[PDB]
Design an enzyme around this catalytic site. Structure first.
Site, mmCIF file in Angstrom:
data_model
loop_
_atom_site.group_PDB
_atom_site.id
_atom_site.type_symbol
_atom_site.label_atom_id
_atom_site.label_comp_id
_atom_site.label_asym_id
_atom_site.label_seq_id
_atom_site.Cartn_x
_atom_site.Cartn_y
_atom_site.Cartn_z
ATOM 1 N N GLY A 12 0.998 -1.151 0.057
ATOM 2 C CA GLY A 12 0.004 -0.023 -0.112
ATOM 3 C C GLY A 12 0.759 1.217 0.059
ATOM 4 N N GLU A 13 0.207 2.455 0.044
ATOM 5 C CA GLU A 13 0.846 3.868 0.063
ATOM 6 C C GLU A 13 0.916 3.859 1.512
ATOM 7 O OE1 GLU A 13 1.234 4.622 -4.276
ATOM 8 O OE2 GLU A 13 2.175 5.234 -2.135
ATOM 9 N N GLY A 14 2.037 4.538 1.787
ATOM 10 C CA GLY A 14 2.122 5.281 3.095
ATOM 11 C C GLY A 14 2.390 6.544 3.176
ATOM 12 N N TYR A 16 4.623 8.603 3.100
ATOM 13 C CA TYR A 16 5.965 9.061 2.350
ATOM 14 C C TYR A 16 6.136 8.616 0.871
ATOM 15 C CZ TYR A 16 6.994 10.877 6.922
ATOM 16 O OH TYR A 16 7.002 11.588 8.289
ATOM 17 N N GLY A 17 5.484 7.631 0.486
ATOM 18 C CA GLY A 17 5.585 6.901 -0.714
ATOM 19 C C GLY A 17 4.954 5.605 -0.573
ATOM 20 N N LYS A 34 10.499 1.226 2.619
ATOM 21 C CA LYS A 34 9.584 2.439 2.421
ATOM 22 C C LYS A 34 10.412 3.194 1.201
ATOM 23 C CE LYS A 34 7.397 1.827 6.820
ATOM 24 N NZ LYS A 34 6.641 2.661 7.723
ATOM 25 N N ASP A 119 4.081 12.446 14.895
ATOM 26 C CA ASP A 119 2.791 11.913 14.162
ATOM 27 C C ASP A 119 2.498 10.349 14.622
ATOM 28 O OD1 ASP A 119 0.879 12.007 12.258
ATOM 29 O OD2 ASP A 119 2.075 10.881 10.832
HETATM 30 N N1 LIG Z 1 7.159 -2.065 9.283
HETATM 31 C C1 LIG Z 1 6.315 -2.476 8.594
HETATM 32 N N2 LIG Z 1 6.051 -3.760 8.547
HETATM 33 C C2 LIG Z 1 5.012 -4.269 7.923
HETATM 34 N N3 LIG Z 1 4.037 -3.340 7.394
HETATM 35 C C3 LIG Z 1 4.224 -2.090 7.419
HETATM 36 C C4 LIG Z 1 5.429 -1.501 8.243
HETATM 37 N N4 LIG Z 1 5.188 -0.252 8.015
HETATM 38 C C5 LIG Z 1 3.766 -0.115 7.353
HETATM 39 N N5 LIG Z 1 3.320 -1.006 7.015
HETATM 40 C C6 LIG Z 1 2.173 -1.260 6.019
HETATM 41 O O1 LIG Z 1 2.344 -0.879 4.798
HETATM 42 C C7 LIG Z 1 1.257 0.065 4.518
HETATM 43 C C8 LIG Z 1 1.314 1.534 4.506
HETATM 44 O O2 LIG Z 1 1.680 1.900 5.937
HETATM 45 P P1 LIG Z 1 1.450 3.206 6.511
HETATM 46 O O3 LIG Z 1 2.405 4.103 6.516
HETATM 47 O O4 LIG Z 1 0.815 2.703 7.853
HETATM 48 O O5 LIG Z 1 0.066 4.042 5.612
HETATM 49 C C9 LIG Z 1 0.023 -0.445 5.546
HETATM 50 O O6 LIG Z 1 -0.571 -1.815 4.950
HETATM 51 C C10 LIG Z 1 0.697 -0.998 6.590
HETATM 52 O O7 LIG Z 1 0.243 -2.242 7.461
#
Ligand SMILES: Nc1ncnc2c1ncn2[C@@H]1O[C@H](COP(=O)(O)O)[C@@H](O)[C@H]1O
Length: 278
Positions: A12-14, A16-17, A34, A119
């Protein structure tokens, strides 16, 4: 070098990217990658986050800067708190108190190295395999580079202060803690002013005695309603013993300089009873 990582699978999209999971073929471990979208020292700053090595902090394993693209490789965690509370409505008070302790412990570790999150939210509180271990993700990234963001934001920021201090993260912790207990957000605002209003509705409107300097903050309105405060006791005093209430109240001091430190929170009597898993 990103070539180390295989089976790179988009999650998915977080913030930052894009975020991916992957296999680290050097260690056989699953990792998270990431992609950090930039355009506007950064590599140095982010690289310093590698020193934040703590069981309650998602490890930054590697910073990869190649072809003018930036990827960060992090420890992988299968679950997170929002998903976990969604799936586990009957979860015990003991799990909730352990998650709280663990969150404060992680935070205190970071604050002691002069690193702020800024955050915190249930979505970056990752859970890794009795009780899962809580591991905070994305410390230090808000700096170094949707209404839900607002719900965990402290009043000094909502009122337009330029100074983020460690107290910001303490506020967010209290909000997350309240949500774990109530199963809904404590202050579910839909705008910065609505957010302040939700806060003032419970805690009362501040003045220059309760929070010296508050009326000089950029977005203070002399016309704010004179909220008395429902009081935290009334909102969630049923869900928490008297000790827990006193801790939560200390974390939700509206003046950031009166807000309890993570360290003093860990020393609070609420955590002296061995009724939780650190
Ligand atoms: N360290 C990590 N390990 C596994 N999944 C992650 C991690 N960080 C973020 N995610 C997943 O990546 C996607 C985007 O993260 P987010 O920054 O929470 O929007 C979501 O599906 C989170 O569940």
């Amino acid at each position: 070098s990103i070539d180390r990582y295989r089976r790179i699978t988009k999650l998915g999209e977080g913030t930052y990217g894009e975020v991916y999971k992957a296999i680290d073929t050097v260690t056989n471990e699953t990792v998270a990658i990431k992609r950090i979208r930039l355009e506007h020292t950064a590599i140095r700053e982010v690289s310093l986050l590698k020193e934040l090595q703590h069981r309650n902090i998602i490890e930054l394993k590697s910073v990869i800067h190649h072809n003018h693209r930036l990827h960060l490789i992090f420890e992988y965690a299968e679950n997170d708190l929002k998903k976990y509370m969604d799936k586990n409505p009957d979860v015990s008070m003991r799990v909730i108190k352990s998650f709280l302790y663990q969150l404060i412990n992680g935070v205190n570790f970071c604050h002691s190295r002069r690193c702020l999150h800024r955050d915190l939210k249930p979505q970056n509180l990752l859970l890794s395999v009795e009780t899962p271990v809580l591991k905070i993700g994305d410390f230090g990234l808000a700096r170094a580079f949707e209404i839900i963001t607002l719900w965990y934001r402290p009043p000094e920021i909502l009122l337009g202060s330029r100074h983020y201090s460690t107290s910001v993260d303490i506020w967010s912790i209290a909000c997350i803690w309240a949500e774990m207990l109530m199963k809904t957000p404590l202050f579910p605002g839909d705008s910065e002013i609505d957010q302040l209003f939700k806060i003032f509705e419970v805690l009362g409107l501040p003045d220059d005695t309760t929070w010296p300097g508050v009326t000089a903050l950029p977005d203070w309105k002399q016309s704010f309603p004179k909220f008395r405060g429902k009081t935290l006791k009334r909102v969630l005093g049923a869900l928490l013993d008297d000790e827990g209430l006193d801790l939560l109240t200390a974390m939700l001091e509206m003046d950031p300089v009166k807000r309890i430190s993570a360290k003093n929170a860990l020393e609070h009597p609420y955590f002296s009873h061995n009724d939780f898993d650190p």
